[PDB]
């Protein structure tokens, strides 16, 4: 198992513009077009972002290429980031794959507020840290998919995902 791997399970993949679970503008797998209510300014965003008239729809192809290019900046993004880099830097590959997966979810913004769980991170305090992750809007809103990524956090290992 990989990043890849873990997010193309949890984002799926779907080559037709569609809403998330919070009912913005998607495609491909889980790349998030505009927060506008405008199918038509999604459109646009498309376009924009492949370079071509795509008109709502691409190829599997290009696709994996968004793809590539948003697991890259969200690594980078934690990189840079005054708050995650630490944290980042004191967990073992798995769990690096967990944070990720927050981050592109989310945005590192988002995942930076998460203050607390982030300091029991860092200390290897597990099980408090995948209580407290759960006690959130995250949490109640996507369960299956927190749940998963908890779990890595929790234990280490890829057993959520099989």
């Known amino acids: 198992m990989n990043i890849f791997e873990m997010l193309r399970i949890?984002?799926?993949?779907?080559?037709?513009?569609?809403?998330?679970?919070?009912?913005?503008?998607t495609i491909g797998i889980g790349h998030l077009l505009t927060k506008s209510p405008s199918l038509n300014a999604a459109k646009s965003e498309l376009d924009?972002?492949?370079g071509r008239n795509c008109?709502?729809?691409i190829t599997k192809d290009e696709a994996e290429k968004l793809f590539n290019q948003d697991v890259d900046a969200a690594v980078r993004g934690?990189?840079?980031?005054?708050?995650?880099k630490?944290?980042?830097?004191?967990?073992?590959?798995?769990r690096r794959c967990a944070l990720?997966?927050?981050?592109?979810?989310?945005?590192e913004t988002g995942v930076a507020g998460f203050?607390?769980?982030?300091?029991?991170?860092?200390?290897?305090?597990?099980?408090?840290?995948?209580?407290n992750l759960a006690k959130s809007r995250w949490y109640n809103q996507t369960?299956?998919?927190?749940?998963r990524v908890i779990t890595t956090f929790r234990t280490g290992t890829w057993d959520a995902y099989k």
């Open 10 to 25: 949890d984002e799926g993949l779907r080559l037709k513009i569609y809403k998330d679970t919070e009912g913005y503008y």
């Open 48 to 50: 924009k972002a492949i």
């Open 55 to 57: 008109n709502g729809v």
């Open 78 to 84: 934690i990189l840079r980031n005054a708050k995650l």
């Open 86 to 94: 630490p944290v980042y830097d004191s967990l073992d590959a798995v």
């Open 100 to 107: 990720i997966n927050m981050v592109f979810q989310m945005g």
């Open 115 to 131: 203050t607390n769980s982030l300091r029991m991170l860092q200390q290897d305090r597990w099980d408090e840290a995948a209580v």
């Open 143 to 147: 369960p299956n998919r927190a749940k």
